[PDB]
Design a protein around this nucleic acid. Structure first.
Ligand SMILES: [K+]
Ligand SMILES: [K+]
Ligand SMILES: [K+]
Ligand SMILES: [Mg+2]
Ligand SMILES: [Mg+2]
Ligand SMILES: [Mg+2]
Ligand SMILES: [Mg+2]
Ligand SMILES: [Mg+2]
Ligand SMILES: [Mg+2]
Ligand SMILES: [Mg+2]
Ligand SMILES: [Mg+2]
Ligand SMILES: [Mg+2]
Ligand SMILES: [Mg+2]
Ligand SMILES: [Mg+2]
Ligand SMILES: [Mg+2]
Ligand SMILES: [Mg+2]
Ligand SMILES: [Mg+2]
Ligand SMILES: [Mg+2]
Ligand SMILES: [Mg+2]
Ligand SMILES: [Mg+2]
Ligand SMILES: [Mg+2]
Ligand SMILES: [Mg+2]
Ligand SMILES: [Mg+2]
Ligand SMILES: [Mg+2]
Ligand SMILES: [Mg+2]
Ligand SMILES: [Mg+2]
Ligand SMILES: [Mg+2]
Ligand SMILES: [Mg+2]
Ligand SMILES: [Mg+2]
Ligand SMILES: [Mg+2]
Ligand SMILES: [Mg+2]
Ligand SMILES: [Mg+2]
Ligand SMILES: [Mg+2]
Ligand SMILES: [Mg+2]
Ligand SMILES: [Mg+2]
Ligand SMILES: [Mg+2]
Ligand SMILES: [Mg+2]
Ligand SMILES: [Mg+2]
Ligand SMILES: [Zn+2]
Lengths: 80, 60, 24, 98, 64, 206
RNA sequence: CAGGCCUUGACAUGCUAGGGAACCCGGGUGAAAGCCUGGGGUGCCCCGCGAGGGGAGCCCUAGCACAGGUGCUGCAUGGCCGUCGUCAGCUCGUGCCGUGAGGUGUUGGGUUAAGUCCCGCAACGAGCGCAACCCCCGCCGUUAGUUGCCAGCGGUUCGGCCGGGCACUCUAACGGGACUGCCCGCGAAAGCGGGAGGAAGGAGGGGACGACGUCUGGUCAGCAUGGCCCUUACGGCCUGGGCGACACACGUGCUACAAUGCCCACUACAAAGCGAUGCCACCCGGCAACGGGGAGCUAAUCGCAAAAAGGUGGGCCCAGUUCGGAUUGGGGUCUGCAACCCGACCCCAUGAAGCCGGAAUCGCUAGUAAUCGCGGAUCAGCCAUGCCGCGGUGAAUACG
């Protein structure tokens, strides 16, 4: 039962940094702190290193994991 | 209540959802009333002194 | 009971409105 | 038709002061609509008595805002003489509406 | 009738009726008093105190 | 750790507020931070004058600020050289064309805050505590009064273990509302920490 | 906590110096901080015809005096609070008794909620406490009618809507009233037990009030403060994370396990409060949360606001059920820069435990318990089932 509204949020830090990598083919890795940003299509086939709060975790973004947010793939806590 | 945090006054939050009352008298940031700008403690003190017009000891 | 979101009481207790408890 | 509300914290001043406006017209105006009470708006403040913990103590404080009406029907022109600058209260506020 | 609840009112009505019924004929007090309909029930919702869940009902303390 | 403030406990009765004025939920706080800041400067300044009370009245941008002092001299100054500085220094903080009286305390030995300050001073002056207390009560108990009492906190004479010395005379029925007990607290900074002096002076009755 | 950064600072008072005044708009890299940089801009004093020169305020660099620490010590401390405990007790003055610590008073008999009062007494009196003066509730009056009503009577757009009246209700100021005063019985008194009259009867209910002191009680993270300790950092900025973890255990609670009950209709009766950049009537879109538009409020005048339990009618027929609503898929609305971690709120689908709880253990003596709903502080929103108040309905029992 998730939600947000009409305007799908994404931080332009990497947006105008992810598409900017497209107008040149592709790239490899992107160091980010903004896990607040919603994963959109122009990312599919990329590798975004998200931040735990300690380190940057590589995250090969895929087709299905679109509607989700970067943070959902960067587990914060460490357990048994 | 480190001076560095009594900077709250900024009003230059960059995002208004960062603003936060904070007692004007003791810097208190945890039980600050609106109508006084004073925390629950400071309010008790000055109230006793009578430096808060009208504010009397309620009973009933 | 006061804990069933979809009942008259559910809404009242939770102090909300909706299909199961319209605003007059 | 002179409506003048009287709001204050002190029911004695806002009361005497209120009966000041009443006579400063009973010598130059309609019998006036007399001094009307009007419910008081109490504001309560409840705080844990001491600092740190002890959440079961607390002390209760209230700010009682008393009110009044007065109201001088018959816009007497001779009344504003006695009711111009012949006041004395210190914690009272006054609203004038015709 | 106004204020309160229908059962409170029922008792209020009980007063007026006997209070008016007395003004009508003061010789009626002598028969009403023995059953005190002339008395005003002072029992009123007792205030809620702090520290207590509701006036008298106190919180529950664990393995003291 | 009990006992309510004697003043706060007697506001509606034998004892009136030190700030009389109505305000709305939009200005009350402002007319307070300021109203308080007034007491802030006046306290640091008119110290030597020995300021007992600092009433303050307000209206449409008006201000009373009646300052009660034992020695009004230091207040006013040379002819009027000072009561002018501290009024221009005052109205500077708050552009409200503020008045500024200077009442005189008839017998400062019935002014609890003063009596407290007195004892407080003597303590910073390495004096003997018990004496000052006994004296204070006497001075106050002699200048008329139906009762009096003084309480110095702890760490007496720099003594490792804090204590609490007091002594008093006449009556000081803190439980009776219809009394009138000027209360006055005075701190006392030292080389070995703070001390707290408290003063009570049972003046009238009904 | 990790990482990127400032280091005379985010904030005080000052200082000697190269320099440009102030303060306005820019651009690079940036996660943001920062850091590098571009123009706009030459006001104010005393000189000088002028170029310009030296000063004021301000800011800027480099070096100072110093800022800053929610760093340690609540046994170095102030202040405030908790606690025994609203328990009825703790003391003093003078006298008297003891070599003395100390005693007497305060013990004793009656009595009381009470060191409350009476009677006794080498004690006579006092303080601090009890009580009483303060608040709220219960009856009546006086003052006061843009809130009350045909109480009356006159017009109904049948709405106290009109007229106009304050009498009622109420609102809120001020007073009246209760004193064991009156009657009988007991007593020596104080004061019991009964009766009358009264709204109210013997502290009429409920508050605020908590003595000398005791826990080396609590708080250095509210604040204040002595002493230690750090100063390119234990100080400061920021982005992100964590305070929300989960094999487990406990406290306080919420919702239940159902028929005296649960649904859906329709209907009736409260009090307190709150409402500018906020309550939001009404109308329209949507199942709805909510969205549009939009009247009124500056608030006894408008709004929050439906009170709910109750009542009338209908359904369910004893089933894990039309009980219970956990969990989990979906699809949405909002606030907010932003709801992954980690927000409520709708709507569809899911429909878990739970048939009243071992040993133990808690509350409450009357408008109390139990039960029902309403408001507020804080607050963008909210994780409030918390807390502080509010008013409906309204018991059981106390031999001892
Ligand atoms: K129930
Ligand atoms: K201690
Ligand atoms: K289960
Ligand atoms: Mg958005
Ligand atoms: Mg500090
Ligand atoms: Mg906030
Ligand atoms: Mg705050
Ligand atoms: Mg159900
Ligand atoms: Mg109740
Ligand atoms: Mg007192
Ligand atoms: Mg020139
Ligand atoms: Mg301690
Ligand atoms: Mg302490
Ligand atoms: Mg500790
Ligand atoms: Mg003696
Ligand atoms: Mg002997
Ligand atoms: Mg002797
Ligand atoms: Mg003795
Ligand atoms: Mg004895
Ligand atoms: Mg006594
Ligand atoms: Mg009446
Ligand atoms: Mg007798
Ligand atoms: Mg008392
Ligand atoms: Mg300790
Ligand atoms: Mg302890
Ligand atoms: Mg301690
Ligand atoms: Mg926590
Ligand atoms: Mg329950
Ligand atoms: Mg049942
Ligand atoms: Mg609609
Ligand atoms: Mg619709
Ligand atoms: Mg979240
Ligand atoms: Mg069953
Ligand atoms: Mg009891
Ligand atoms: Mg609620
Ligand atoms: Mg809220
Ligand atoms: Mg939650
Ligand atoms: Mg709630
Ligand atoms: Zn404060």
């Amino acid at each position: 039962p998730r939600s947000l509204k009409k305007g799908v949020f994404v931080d332009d830090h990497l947006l105008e940094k992810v598409l900017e990598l497209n107008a040149k083919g592709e790239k490899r890795l992107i160091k980010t702190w903004s896990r607040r940003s919603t994963i959109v299509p122009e990312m599919v086939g990329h590798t975004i290193a998200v931040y735990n709060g300690k380190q940057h975790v590589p995250v090969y973004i895929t087709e299905n994991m679109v509607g989700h947010k970067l943070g959902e793939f960067a587990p914060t806590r460490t357990y048994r | 209540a480190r001076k560095a945090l009594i900077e709250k006054a900024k009003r230059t939050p960059k995002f208004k959802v960062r603003a936060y009352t904070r007692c004007v008298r003791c810097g208190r940031a945890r039980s600050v009333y609106r109508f006084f700008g004073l925390c629950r403690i400071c309010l008790r003190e000055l109230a006793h002194k009578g430096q808060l017009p009208g504010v009397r000891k309620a009973s009933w | 009971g006061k804990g069933d979101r979809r009942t008259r009481r559910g809404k009242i207790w939770r102090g909300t409105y909706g299909k199961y408890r319209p605003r007059k | 038709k002179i409506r003048i509300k009287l709001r204050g914290f002190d029911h004695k001043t806002l009361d005497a002061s209120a009966q000041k406006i009443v006579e400063a017209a009973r010598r130059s105006g309609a019998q006036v609509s007399g001094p009307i009470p009007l419910p008081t708006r109490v504001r309560r403040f409840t705080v844990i008595r001491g600092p740190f913990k002890h959440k079961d103590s607390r002390e209760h404080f209230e700010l009682r805002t008393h009110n009044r009406l007065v109201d001088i029907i018959n816009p007497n022109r001779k009344t504003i003489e006695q009711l111009m600058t012949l006041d004395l209260p210190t914690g009272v506020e006054i609203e004038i509406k015709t | 009738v106004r204020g309160g609840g229908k059962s409170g009112q029922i008792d209020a009505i009980k007063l007026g009726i006997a209070r008016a019924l007395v003004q009508y004929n003061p010789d009626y007090r002598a028969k009403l008093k023995p059953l005190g309909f002339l008395t005003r029930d002072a029992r009123v919702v007792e205030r809620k105190k702090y520290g207590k869940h509701k006036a008298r009902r106190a919180p529950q303390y664990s393995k003291r | 750790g009990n006992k309510i403030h004697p003043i706060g406990f007697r506001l509606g009765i034998t004892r009136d507020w030190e700030s009389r004025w109505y305000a709305g939920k939009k200005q009350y706080r402002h007319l307070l931070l300021e109203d308080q800041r007034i007491r802030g400067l006046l306290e640091k300044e008119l110290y030597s004058a020995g300021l007992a009370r600092v009433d303050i009245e307000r209206a449409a941008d008006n201000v009373a600020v009646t300052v009660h002092v034992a020695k009004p001299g230091v207040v006013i100054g040379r002819g009027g050289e000072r009561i002018r500085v501290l009024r221009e220094e005052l109205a500077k903080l708050t552009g409200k064309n503020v008045a500024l009286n200077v009442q005189e305390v008839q017998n400062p030995n019935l002014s609890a805050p003063l009596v407290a300050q007195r004892v407080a001073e003597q303590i910073e002056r390495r004096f003997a505590v018990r004496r000052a207390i006994k004296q204070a009560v006497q001075r106050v108990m002699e200048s008329g009064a139906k009762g009096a009492k003084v309480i110095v906190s702890g760490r007496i004479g720099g003594a490792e273990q804090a204590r609490t010395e007091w002594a008093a005379q006449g009556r000081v029925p803190l439980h009776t509302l219809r009394a009138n007990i000027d209360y006055g607290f005075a701190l006392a900074r030292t080389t070995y920490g703070v001390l707290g002096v408290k003063a009570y002076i049972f003046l009238g009755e009904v």
